Amino acid sequence: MAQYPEQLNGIFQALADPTRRAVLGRLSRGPATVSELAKPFDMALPSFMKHIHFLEDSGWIRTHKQGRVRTCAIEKEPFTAVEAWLAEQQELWESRT
Amino acid sequence: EQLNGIFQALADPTRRAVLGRLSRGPATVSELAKPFDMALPSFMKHIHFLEDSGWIRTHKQGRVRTCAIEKEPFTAVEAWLAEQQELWESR
Numbered sequence: 001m002a003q004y005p006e007q008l009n010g011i012f013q014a015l016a017d018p019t020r021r022a023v024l025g026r027l028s029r030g031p032a033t034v035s036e037l038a039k040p041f042d043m044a045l046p047s048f049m050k051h052i053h054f055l056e057d058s059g060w061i062r063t064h065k066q067g068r069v070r071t072c073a074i075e076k077e078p079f080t081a082v083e084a085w086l087a088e089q090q091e092l093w094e095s096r097t
Numbered sequence: 098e099q100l101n102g103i104f105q106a107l108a109d110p111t112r113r114a115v116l117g118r119l120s121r122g123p124a125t126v127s128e129l130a131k132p133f134d135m136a137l138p139s140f141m142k143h144i145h146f147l148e149d150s151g152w153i154r155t156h157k158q159g160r161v162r163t164c165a166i167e168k169e170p171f172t173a174v175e176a177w178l179a180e181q182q183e184l185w186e187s188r
């Protein structure tokens with residue numbers, strides 16, 4: 001039984017944005033604060049926060065606020081989900097008779 | 098801007114299910130449209146997005162448009178994933 005579609009929709013939508021993919025690339029190297037993550041990007045912080053929030057809501061990252069500081073870390077589950085969906089299609093392709 | 102389109106294509110469940118079917122072999126739009134309770138014009142727009150993003154190729158002869166899944170987007174998604182995995186391992 002394939003994963004329910006609603007779980008995958010948001011996971012893939014998160015990856016459709018280059019800012020979000022860049023943030024995930026950084027968090028793959030280890031955790032970071034929002035202010036650190038925002039530095040490469042020419043957008044106002046509210047616009048950047050939309051990306052952070054989307055990443056958290058879709059399960060790609062976890063964040064924690066203490067005072068004015070918000071720490072972020074990558075989550076591995078969505079990687080597993082993407083891998084799983086891909087592998088399923090690739091099994092169908094390689095098993096063609 | 099290329100992974101943007103590839104992943105935006107994958108964000109829709111209809112588009113994912115079409116790519117599932119095309120993984121089994123090529124198919125006409127008519128064949129692909131069959132499982133879904135969707136107006137053809139809405140369906141065509143999913144097909145059009147899949148083609149435009151690079152996930153599929155299509156070709157029309159007479160009244161029949163045949164669709165085939167493309168290799169390159171899979172390689173691209175696999176590349177993004179491998180790139181992330183290599184970053185996690187780095188010390």
Ligand SMILES: [Br-]
Nearest residue numbers: 005006009110
């Ligand atoms: Br859905």
Ligand SMILES: [Br-]
Nearest residue numbers: 034035069070
């Ligand atoms: Br911060």
Ligand SMILES: [Br-]
Nearest residue numbers: 125126127162
């Ligand atoms: Br057709």
